[PDB]
Amino acid sequence: MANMHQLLTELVNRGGSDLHLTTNSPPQIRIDGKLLPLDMPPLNAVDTKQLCYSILTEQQKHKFEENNELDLSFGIKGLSRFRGNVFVQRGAVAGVFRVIPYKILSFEELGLPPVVRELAEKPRGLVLVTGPTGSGKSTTLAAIIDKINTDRHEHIVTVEDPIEYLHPHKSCVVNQREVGADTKSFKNALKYILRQDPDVVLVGELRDLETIEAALTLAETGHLCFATLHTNSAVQTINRIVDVFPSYQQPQVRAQLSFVLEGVLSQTLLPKASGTGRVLAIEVMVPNPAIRNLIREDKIHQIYSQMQVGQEKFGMMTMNQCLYGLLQKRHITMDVGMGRSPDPDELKQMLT
Amino acid sequence: MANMHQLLTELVNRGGSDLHLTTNSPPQIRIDGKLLPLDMPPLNAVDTKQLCYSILTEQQKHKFEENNELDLSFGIKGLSRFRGNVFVQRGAVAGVFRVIPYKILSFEELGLPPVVRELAEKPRGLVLVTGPTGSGKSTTLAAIIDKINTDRHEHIVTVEDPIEYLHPHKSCVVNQREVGADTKSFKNALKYILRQDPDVVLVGELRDLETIEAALTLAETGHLCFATLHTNSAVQTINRIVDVFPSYQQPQVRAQLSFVLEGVLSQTLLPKASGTGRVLAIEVMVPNPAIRNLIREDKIHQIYSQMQVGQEKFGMMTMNQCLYGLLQKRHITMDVGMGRSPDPDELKQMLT
Amino acid sequence: MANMHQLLTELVNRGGSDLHLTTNSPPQIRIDGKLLPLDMPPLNAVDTKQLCYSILTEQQKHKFEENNELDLSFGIKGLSRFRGNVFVQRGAVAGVFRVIPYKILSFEELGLPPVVRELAEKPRGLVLVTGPTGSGKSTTLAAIIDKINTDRHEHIVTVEDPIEYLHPHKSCVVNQREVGADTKSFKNALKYILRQDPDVVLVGELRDLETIEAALTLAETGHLCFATLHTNSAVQTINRIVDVFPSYQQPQVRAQLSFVLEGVLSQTLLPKASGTGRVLAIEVMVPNPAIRNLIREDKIHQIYSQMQVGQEKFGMMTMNQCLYGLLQKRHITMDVGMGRSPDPDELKQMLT
Amino acid sequence: MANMHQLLTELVNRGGSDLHLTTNSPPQIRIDGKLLPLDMPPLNAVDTKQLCYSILTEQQKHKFEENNELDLSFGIKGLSRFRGNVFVQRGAVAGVFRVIPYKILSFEELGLPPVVRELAEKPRGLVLVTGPTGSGKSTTLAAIIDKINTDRHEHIVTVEDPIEYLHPHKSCVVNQREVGADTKSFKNALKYILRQDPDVVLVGELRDLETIEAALTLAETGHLCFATLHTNSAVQTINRIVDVFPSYQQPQVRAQLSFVLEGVLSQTLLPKASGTGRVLAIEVMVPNPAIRNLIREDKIHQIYSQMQVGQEKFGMMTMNQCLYGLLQKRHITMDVGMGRSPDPDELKQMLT
Amino acid sequence: MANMHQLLTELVNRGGSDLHLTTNSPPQIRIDGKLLPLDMPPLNAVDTKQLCYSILTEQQKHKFEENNELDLSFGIKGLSRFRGNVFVQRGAVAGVFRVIPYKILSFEELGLPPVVRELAEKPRGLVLVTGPTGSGKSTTLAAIIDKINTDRHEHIVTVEDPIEYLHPHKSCVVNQREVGADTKSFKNALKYILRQDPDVVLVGELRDLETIEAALTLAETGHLCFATLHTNSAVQTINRIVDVFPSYQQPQVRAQLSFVLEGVLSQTLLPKASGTGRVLAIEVMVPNPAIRNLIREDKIHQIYSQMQVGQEKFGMMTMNQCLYGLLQKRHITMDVGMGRSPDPDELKQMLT
Ligand SMILES: Nc1ncnc2c1ncn2[C@@H]1O[C@H](COP(=O)(O)OP(=O)(O)OP(=O)(O)O)[C@@H](O)[C@H]1O
Ligand SMILES: Nc1ncnc2c1ncn2[C@@H]1O[C@H](COP(=O)(O)OP(=O)(O)OP(=O)(O)O)[C@@H](O)[C@H]1O
Ligand SMILES: Nc1ncnc2c1ncn2[C@@H]1O[C@H](COP(=O)(O)OP(=O)(O)OP(=O)(O)O)[C@@H](O)[C@H]1O
Ligand SMILES: Nc1ncnc2c1ncn2[C@@H]1O[C@H](COP(=O)(O)OP(=O)(O)OP(=O)(O)O)[C@@H](O)[C@H]1O
Ligand SMILES: Nc1ncnc2c1ncn2[C@@H]1O[C@H](COP(=O)(O)OP(=O)(O)OP(=O)(O)O)[C@@H](O)[C@H]1O
Numbered sequence A, B, C, D, E: 001m002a003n004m005h006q007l008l009t010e011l012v013n014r015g016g017s018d019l020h021l022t023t024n025s026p027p028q029i030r031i032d033g034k035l036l037p038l039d040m041p042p043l044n045a046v047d048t049k050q051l052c053y054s055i056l057t058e059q060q061k062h063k064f065e066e067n068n069e070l071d072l073s074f075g076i077k078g079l080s081r082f083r084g085n086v087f088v089q090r091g092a093v094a095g096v097f098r099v100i101p102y103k104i105l106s107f108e109e110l111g112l113p114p115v116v117r118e119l120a121e122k123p124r125g126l127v128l129v130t131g132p133t134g135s136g137k138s139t140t141l142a143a144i145i146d147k148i149n150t151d152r153h154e155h156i157v158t159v160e161d162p163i164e165y166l167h168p169h170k171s172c173v174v175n176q177r178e179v180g181a182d183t184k185s186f187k188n189a190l191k192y193i194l195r196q197d198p199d200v201v202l203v204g205e206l207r208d209l210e211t212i213e214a215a216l217t218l219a220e221t222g223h224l225c226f227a228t229l230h231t232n233s234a235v236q237t238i239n240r241i242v243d244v245f246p247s248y249q250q251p252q253v254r255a256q257l258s259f260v261l262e263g264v265l266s267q268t269l270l271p272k273a274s275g276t277g278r279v280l281a282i283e284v285m286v287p288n289p290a291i292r293n294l295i296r297e298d299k300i301h302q303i304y305s306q307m308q309v310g311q312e313k314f315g316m317m318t319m320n321q322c323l324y325g326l327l328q329k330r331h332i333t334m335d336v337g338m339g340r341s342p343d344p345d346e347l348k349q350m351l352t
Helices: A002-013 A045-053 A058-067 A114-119 A137-151 A186-196 A209-220 A234-243 A250-260 A289-296 A300-308 A319-328 A334-340 A344-351 B002-013 B045-053 B058-067 B114-119 B137-151 B186-196 B209-220 B234-243 B250-260 B289-296 B300-308 B319-328 B334-340 B344-351 C002-013 C045-053 C058-067 C114-119 C137-151 C186-196 C209-220 C234-243 C250-260 C289-296 C300-308 C319-328 C334-340 C344-351 D002-013 D045-053 D058-067 D114-119 D137-151 D186-196 D209-220 D234-243 D250-260 D289-296 D300-308 D319-328 D334-340 D344-351 E002-013 E045-053 E058-067 E114-119 E137-151 E186-196 E209-220 E234-243 E250-260 E289-296 E300-308 E319-328 E334-340 E344-351
Strands: A018-021 A028-031 A034-037 A069-076 A080-089 A092-100 A125-130 A155-160 A173-178 A200-205 A224-229 A261-271 A278-285 B018-021 B028-031 B034-037 B069-076 B080-089 B092-100 B125-130 B155-160 B173-178 B200-205 B224-229 B261-271 B278-285 C018-021 C028-031 C034-037 C069-076 C080-089 C092-100 C125-130 C155-160 C173-178 C200-205 C224-229 C261-271 C278-285 D018-021 D028-031 D034-037 D069-076 D080-089 D092-100 D125-130 D155-160 D173-178 D200-205 D224-229 D261-271 D278-285 E018-021 E028-031 E034-037 E069-076 E080-089 E092-100 E125-130 E155-160 E173-178 E200-205 E224-229 E261-271 E278-285
Touching: A002 A018, A002 A028, A002 A045, A002 A080, A002 A092, A018 A045, A045 A092, A058 A069, A069 D186, A080 D173, A080 D186, A092 D186, A114 A137, A114 A261, A125 A137, A125 A209, A137 A155, A137 A200, A137 A224, A137 A261, A155 A186, A173 B080, A186 A200, A186 A209, A186 B069, A186 B080, A186 B092, A200 A209, A209 A224, A209 A250, A234 A250, A234 A261, A234 A300, A234 D250, A250 A261, A250 A289, A250 B234, A278 A300, A278 A319, A289 A300, A319 A334, A319 A344, A334 A344, B002 B018, B002 B028, B002 B045, B002 B080, B002 B092, B018 B045, B045 B092, B058 B069, B114 B137, B114 B261, B125 B137, B125 B209, B137 B155, B137 B200, B137 B224, B137 B261, B155 B186, B173 C080, B186 B200, B186 B209, B186 C069, B186 C080, B186 C092, B200 B209, B209 B224, B209 B250, B234 B250, B234 B261, B234 B300, B250 B261, B250 B289, B250 C234, B278 B300, B278 B319, B289 B300, B319 B334, B319 B344, B334 B344, C002 C018, C002 C028, C002 C045, C002 C080, C002 C092, C018 C045, C045 C092, C058 C069, C114 C137, C114 C261, C125 C137, C125 C209, C137 C155, C137 C200, C137 C224, C137 C261, C155 C186, C186 C200, C186 C209, C200 C209, C209 C224, C209 C250, C234 C250, C234 C261, C234 C300, C250 C261, C250 C289, C278 C300, C278 C319, C289 C300, C319 C334, C319 C344, C334 C344, D002 D018, D002 D028, D002 D045, D002 D080, D002 D092, D018 D045, D045 D092, D058 D069, D069 E186, D080 E173, D080 E186, D092 E186, D114 D137, D114 D261, D125 D137, D125 D209, D137 D155, D137 D200, D137 D224, D137 D261, D155 D186, D186 D200, D186 D209, D200 D209, D209 D224, D209 D250, D234 D250, D234 D261, D234 D300, D234 E250, D250 D261, D250 D289, D278 D300, D278 D319, D289 D300, D319 D334, D319 D344, D334 D344, E002 E018, E002 E028, E002 E045, E002 E080, E002 E092, E018 E045, E045 E092, E058 E069, E114 E137, E114 E261, E125 E137, E125 E209, E137 E155, E137 E200, E137 E224, E137 E261, E155 E186, E186 E200, E186 E209, E200 E209, E209 E224, E209 E250, E234 E250, E234 E261, E234 E300, E250 E261, E250 E289, E278 E300, E278 E319, E289 E300, E319 E334, E319 E344, E334 E344
Parallel strands: A125 A224, A125 A261, A155 A173, A155 A200, A200 A224, B125 B224, B125 B261, B155 B173, B155 B200, B200 B224, C125 C224, C125 C261, C155 C173, C155 C200, C200 C224, D125 D224, D125 D261, D155 D173, D155 D200, D200 D224, E125 E224, E125 E261, E155 E173, E155 E200, E200 E224
Antiparallel strands: A018 A028, A018 A092, A028 A034, A069 A080, A080 A092, A261 A278, B018 B028, B018 B092, B028 B034, B069 B080, B080 B092, B261 B278, C018 C028, C018 C092, C028 C034, C069 C080, C080 C092, C261 C278, D018 D028, D018 D092, D028 D034, D069 D080, D080 D092, D261 D278, E018 E028, E018 E092, E028 E034, E069 E080, E080 E092, E261 E278
């Protein structure tokens, strides 16, 4: 297991995002999104199995061997937590491991504007931070969470599969439930969450319509609800959300959403223009009454225009506006911003 | 268990709403909505398990250990009843506990207007008191119930999961059924409720369409039916109610509702402007024939206008009208009322 | 068990409608709709269990203890039959008991007009007597049944859960089947009813669409079919009946109903104006060809007008017309009739 | 087993596509699409069973004998991999075997234009290579895959039933999962694929709507997704894709597809005009913004026109345009191209 | 069993279509469609059971005794194959047996025009031969199959329940799979058919929508697919085919059908006008581009007109046109042709 300790130590030490372990390759680490093979012998099935098994319970070993899959989380005392996935490929064990720092960075350390912190003082509603896997969403969510834990005397509940970031008690009481151990299911967690007197809730992935209904109920019943999506924009998010429902319930969903929605963020971690480190590009939508009317009226497409003009009033920001700030600040290259701009000529006009 | 007795004693003694118990935090109590950590050592899993187990049957212990969840209710002789939820988080026992006083307050003690008491003399129909969890709904419902028990020679049946407020016999015969012990299910309770010759019924949460159909049947079959929702307004409630049905049955539901509906209340407990205690803010809708026509005709949006003008005739009251009374009486601050007003300028006009 | 015999004896002797038995209350009896506690000690769980168990088979005891619910019927030789419901509340046995006289009253004793007796000579179709639970429906149905049994040489079959009124043989052969003992289910009864050569059928409650289809089949296949509903008017009944079907089958249902429907009654037992005894208020709809056209054409709302004008020709009678007769005869008070009148001014015009 | 080794050796040695083994026929090999019986005795059930069993595990033998079917893949060290199907016909074992070379050919060796190689540098999206079974799709896909493995430092994951082409590590980490051994199902693979930090994904056949949704999610969540279809054209492919969804979700699918779609290829292996060897005929669709608008707007039919004019800008190519190049180069005969041309006169005009 | 051998021998010897065996009747044979009782004692249950059991395996005996039904096929060496159905009626064994000659007749022997033989050279698509049971469909299909087996070096796969005609190897490799022995199901056969490298496929009856989708997939994926229906005309066939699909997929089905459909035949065996033997009457539809447009455009009714005019170009032939040829050739009587003519006056006009 000592080898594994050193690989995770190097992952941490090298600012690496993720460690990949598979047979016939040396361990490889993703740093700022790119793989680097380590100067190590190629792994065999014995190596991957013994190292991965060194951090498993008898039940977890039984579980992976029962399913050839295992999602899990674990902590290394004095170092960090990690999220692990173990699987089987070509008849051999393989593993992927995500870092979870013990220390959650602040908005300014993350390059996040102050308006998210003011959102952290909201007593209730749903504010969404979206983007692909590992785009800092759990980390961002954890920063907002830690700020509330520090600042409020409220009840924070998280439901996670598995628990990633740990939020020990500050000013809040924080309870963190791992699905399949602490609670039978997300569904079971929702079966008991209203009897646990929460104020703030982390619900994990918006996996199905039922979870969406649960989130709408939570945000409308006096709770602060946090959730994630893998969508890339506010409009794409809203269309995705409406269309999961049968046609007859989308009117209600639009009214509900207009009432309970407090924010939509769509974020990504990009390689920095300097060639070292990664930088966050984020599109920000803050609903105003006009936007809430657009939500109720099924006039989704014009929402982009509100984000184009909500910079001064509400701190809103289209992705192109974020690319503009990163480009003037030389945080990103011209090609990535233009390659993502829905109107590259527009971003040029904003830049010049 | 003596420790637990003292925490619940302090909860009662301190006018605290809810007690929160979890590991690595001292016991914390929500008083008037806000958490206060007690000057006690942080709890461990052993503490939470032994204390919570001290009030469990062997079956209840088996049940929580079987599910890592348990909703339950219990009484402390000479003190109070309590509703408990026990769950597991981070691999450790946690618990939340709601007070249930033995004495139910009256309308005037609760700040409830006399019209609800006149509603308590209604022989049948459905009157709904809604709001978020712990907004006094069960307490309000219990006060109306106790008034009927005191005043009528009728049959009161409650179905609860679990039984919260106890209503010993006054002038009525009162039977209280806990789902999963007294009856197999809400569904089973409804299977036998018509053969038990009831006059007044408490059905618990409107959890599904079937429960809605049961309530419509009860209110139309000569019974007085009580139910709760977590909606925040009459219009939001009605839209929610109609939209749960398939499109083809909403016409019937509108006709049924127009016939059987006798009242919709949407209430909340707010921190008082004085900074000590909590005050009820409540929106009141009493259907008149005009409103019943609006119900049948699917002209829901104009219902708000009827509540704006039903103050003198029927005692109706919009939320803004309630905020007006609380603001002139300095019961609530200007910011909370304005932050909840659908037209803050309108509330200002009413105030000045 | 002797105590129980005396309570049921008092129930019979006192003209009481229903006996209620539950812990921490003396036995209470509903007489003319209102509860009276008996001058007896409060019951405990032991009392209710021993008394109720004294009239149970080992299977029935097992059944209630298996389900904490039991619907049942039983006879007391030389006294009466009774319908019982036993359940559990607050962890204790409770029971409710309805009287079933051995002697069925006649139309004139019941205040029922002669046209129902002429309906009793109809060879086939469906005539419905509706109203809330215990509104005399089973008793009314039994009177019509007993008249046919007395007058016809036909085959009467009843399917009941449980069997209530017993109809020993007069001129008909009368077979009475209790669901769950005599037959597996209502569905099973319908599976075998056509092979039992019936002429007259009692089907119990119209519990689902399937039962409705069975009743339509029976009435169209040369049988006389009896059924109940808990609806309060002909129009409300018809709308309820049509809307249970998918939209595509309602046209057929309207044609079928127009063919097979022979009568709709909506009845209620009301406290008498004298303050002693109860009086039947009943709305009567007898389909004429015009009404049958209205049934086929989905022009339901105008049916009320036909009942307003079918007094002289067919003996039809709106609820207001019944209230008129009861008011001129001082059988009911002005407030109950007006409180139920869809147009109280209309009833006043009819009265003055 | 030595006999089987020689048949597969001849299959490889003779440039044969596929080996067919069944009773009462000698082994027959498909070379360039056409069967040739080998100068061997006819097989019996004993021959086919012993030879096929010589390459099976006890579980695989049990599996075929349990199901009379088995799909499988295997390698012959120093020779090649093979995909096998074993089944039963007329009560006897039969087998079919596809070659899988250890060496994947390059685009130029395959006659594939350079634009596919530039597509191989795309960081994400879905590019589809379609055509009938054994039309070189897995081989083409493997060539693109091997190019990425050679050129990128990324994570390649394949899910296959069974694994066909093996891609040992070059510059990427490549994990290959066989459904039913490495992973429980395609569904299970998708359950864990997002926790394995992939960059490039091979998903196998687009077998159902769920797989389509998974592919859309992968392409939108920052991954490069590879999939196959057995469709023969871009328009036929798109119509097939849209119509698998319920009508209410096709709008979203069109928006999603317009966002994530990066390429549609429809390919076939044809006998060469020379009479020796086979030649690829391929229709190429590369979405441009105009095409993406056509995708969003449900204006599918005009897509063919864009391919007719996307030769110079994007390297697009209709099937007729491919037939034109093959005909001028005398790679295919006039009859095959004309027999497949949707407008043979158009192809003639292009040729003359 | 010797008796049974003689009955089947007489069936073969007498040119009888089918043998019927049941108790209390002598064996009866259908010759040219009409039953003839044999000059034999009436059968009892013992006779039918022993004779039928004489050709059963222990499993087949168990199977019939388990189900009182059995479909099966068997061969008599040096004589013929037979398709058997064994069942139970009135508590006794009964059996019906269809002949399957070892020698398949040619098109000219069958009176089939040369165009079907040219269709036998088609590399792919679906050509359908329909008609009632025992109308020569399997025999016709077998003749086309045998011609391909003789003429091509391709892979022929049949899936049958049970296998009827046997096609030993000629120039093709022919594998014949009996459902329930060789393969688990038609569904399982389709699960493995694409991994068996087929060129030509016989799929049996088009039993459900899934089979239709499988056939469309096969015909579009480069295979030659054979299937049967019991429809009597091209238009009736097409309407039947479209309407099995949900309304939303019929557009796609029309496009698919227009692409993959290569022929529709609707055939019948009729008693000859001479009074000895039977003659085939067949309606022939060969799709042209105009017809393919009609398929895509849902303009089915006008397809009959194309068959009326496709005689010279494509060899198409309406049923009336076939009756015309048979009537001028005195193969059928005037009454049968006129009794089947959709316009008997039209057939008269064609004849005179
Ligand atoms: N502003 C940031 N700058 C650079 N790296 C960041 C930033 N925010 C988060 N990260 C890093 O992104 C990686 C993923 O973190 P995180 O798990 O929170 O993202 P995620 O989107 O929630 O992943 P998942 O979808 O699996 O939950 C981590 O290495 C984290 O340190
Ligand atoms: N007028 C009131 N003023 C102050 N506190 C009140 C008032 N009415 C009720 N409460 C308190 O609110 C808290 C919750 O009481 P209650 O359970 O009745 O509300 P609830 O909405 O029914 O909760 P749940 O949704 O779980 O059933 C209790 O502490 C109760 O004493
Ligand atoms: N005309 C009447 N006047 C006074 N009491 C009546 C009259 N008719 C019936 N009753 C009484 O009403 C009570 C209920 O009788 P019954 O069971 O027939 O009504 P029900 O509607 O069928 O009840 P359920 O719905 O449970 O079947 C009995 O006490 C009966 O004697
Ligand atoms: N350009 C090419 N020229 C000649 N043969 C080729 C070419 N590309 C692939 N092939 C051959 O086609 C045959 C099938 O290869 P492959 O399995 O990749 O096709 P496929 O469509 O993926 O089959 P399946 O649908 O079963 O996955 C092989 O013999 C392969 O060598
Ligand atoms: N041209 C023909 N002339 C006379 N008899 C024929 C002709 N073609 C086939 N038959 C005979 O028709 C009878 C049925 O043969 P066959 O099983 O092929 O028809 P089928 O429609 O496929 O029956 P099924 O629907 O059960 O598969 C046989 O006796 C066969 O010899």
